[PDB]
Symmetry: D2
Subunit: 209 residues, 4 copies
């Protein structure tokens, strides 16, 4: 790359044509709507969980992605490594707003199912989710060639789904639900970063933290 | 204002919650829709006309805004000083797009009316608007015998109005047309700059030039 | 281009490695330095003069760049079309600061020399430059294959030179002077926009207006 | 905080007056310079270590900062919780660059000292630092028998110190070393984010990851 690439003011001002929204704008768009089911992706949507994925990679498959298909990894990831996962502020704000609305709150994750899991407790605890709004996390798993989330959004009648991945947005689209994008943080170990806004979907401002 | 204020990455990544759109997105939204009337504000929407307004302020009221109520100024402004106005590329793109659709093109200005005007010719020439799509500039306002921007949009069944000022957006909203915002350039002499998107309207990307 | 290109937060936060400065920072870096000669480029540095260049193009060579070698154009451009040129705020601030310092102020322009010129008066007037700091504009002209400015920076012992063009910065470099970049506005008819910072030079923040 | 705040192009193009640099620019500045001692702060400079700090706050002082004065926390933090810390790519690039130069690599941390520490191994492993360039982590501070970050930089003749906090920059400045700033990530639990560039120091581009 050039040592001194420079810039110009067209470039400095240039905006991607993205429908950006705030939590306040979402809440307003739902004003007077009665309680409904809504859902959240977990990783890079409500939890910065890269710490535990990074430990798993290093412990179980330093050269490859094999750790993500290792049951010994998932058993660690789902039963205590989320103690090191950093809650996202956008998620605190979204979840408070949905509890305010009286909405049923679901978490739908591509993480693999394990014998036991403490993830539901970590989420209920960290985000102050009352018993009545909280539901046990759905571990839909990862199966290339299939969006494992879509069936679950349909089964739970989820009408809004938040996620950082293209699969989160298209799971919502698959069922006619409203898909809303959260920015994956740039220090996530899950790379490349997705193209937020790539489906014409809403993207929440400042949602990387 | 510290000499060395510094910054941080939250501020660097910070986005206003704005519904940004492109010309391509607007065109996409109109696919299959029959020819219709569309409208443009003039100043800082299709022409950077500050050069003529700057000269008029210096010439007719260097220490006030009285030049804007001075018939002598308007006669100059509407009969040749737009030879120094700079066409905005966002407008070239939109007018080409609407002409290709077979839309009727209208211009609705709050400039004071004059005995003669050469602004219609300047616009048809600069923007290569065919005679069949072109319409004489409409001078809207609140002087006796005039109609407001709103009433003209209603009269001409204008379905989409493009403008840089709050009043262009509200004019369209008042009659249920689609108000679409264009950025006023930072070097405009019409200050302060409006808050594009202040009504949750669509704002065109990169529309300051 | 894709209809919905999207973005990510690495891209949103990404900064070119540019030495950005404020007028306050420049003034501080010169604190206690005795009066010296400094110089300014005119076009897109102190004056948004695109109005007159745009009129010249349209009047004299709508299909080409031939107007810039037409003496009939320069005679118009240098004797009254700068009445439509919009002073830049960065230049008001820079020039006030240099007058404060007791600096000798020069304007060095690639515009062609004419029989008479009112540009010096326009500049002295618009920027409130006292007789003692003001010097007549130097019309160095345009001669491909030669930086016509460098000899003049040498002759006048100019120690700091402000400009939007690569030739302004390298004229300063040619003579060991401090070259400082001003952003060309995105609505200028002089395109493409230069790569500000391309020589490792300082670039003044917000200098497009 | 309006629901729909909008924006304008002055704000969109606005740049803080910061001396931004790249790794390539830093390396260029060191061309021909013999091997030397360089230094790195640890937390939010070379490691995103918030995961361990977040767990310690929840574990040892959920409602205060007392965990930072709790020997039990530090013993955990310095003896394994950095397996969940995420290496910053800006640090990989700088350490590789300095190692290739044959520079001595130092780490100077304000973390509390412990009986044993495994952080040196974590850093040498994660960053592939050869034994000949690696040095045991230095724990600096103001406890009896300790020396400050400044005194250690002086002691080890560290010529360049990289850090995210104000105190890293001032430490280097105090002894006449080159203080270079790295952006603290927005999802760090160490808040508020510092104003990188607050002392007119160089700030590395894109250094939040
Ligand atoms: N490196 C990672 N950091 C955080 N989360 C991760 C990482 N790698 C994989 N994941 C999980 C992504 O979620 C799977 P889903 O999108 O199907 O729910
Ligand atoms: N500086 C200016 N002050 C007031 N009006 C101005 C100025 N520059 C241009 N204009 C015209 C704005 O258009 C009026 P409209 O928005 O009613 O069409
Ligand atoms: N379109 C233009 N707008 C403003 N200034 C212009 C334009 N075209 C040419 N110029 C003059 C550029 O200055 C020549 P210099 O950089 O040698 O001083
Ligand atoms: N949340 C935190 N509060 C205080 N210190 C913290 C926190 N997270 C990480 N750290 C360590 C910062 O390093 C201390 P140093 O800058 O003296 O090396
Ligand atoms: Mg995810
Ligand atoms: Mg207007
Ligand atoms: Mg110039
Ligand atoms: Mg630190």
């Amino acid at each position: 790359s050039p040592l001194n690439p420079g810039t110009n003011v067209a470039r400095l001002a240039e905006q991607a044509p993205i429908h950006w929204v705030s939590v306040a704008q979402i809440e307003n768009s739902l004003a007077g709507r009665p309680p409904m089911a809504v859902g959240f992706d977990i990783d890079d949507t409500v939890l910065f969980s890269s710490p535990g994925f990074w430990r798993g990679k290093k412990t179980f498959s330093p050269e490859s992605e094999d750790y993500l298909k290792n049951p010994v990894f998932w058993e660690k990831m789902n039963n205590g490594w989320d103690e090191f996962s950093i809650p996202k502020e956008v998620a605190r704000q979204l979840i408070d707003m949905h509890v305010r609305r009286g909405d049923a709150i679901f978490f739908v994750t591509g993480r693999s199912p394990t014998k036991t899991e403490t993830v539901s407790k970590t989420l209920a605890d960290n985000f102050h989710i009352p018993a009545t709004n909280m539901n046990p996390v759905i571990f839909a798993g990862d199966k290339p060639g299939q969006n494992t989330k879509s069936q679950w959004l349909q089964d739970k009648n989820i009408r809004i789904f938040y996620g950082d991945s293209d699969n989160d947005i298209t799971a919502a689209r698959d069922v006619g639900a409203r898909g809303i994008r959260i920015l994956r943080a740039s220090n996530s170990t899950y790379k490349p970063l997705p193209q937020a806004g790539a489906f014409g979907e809403e993207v929440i401002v400042n949602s990387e933290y």
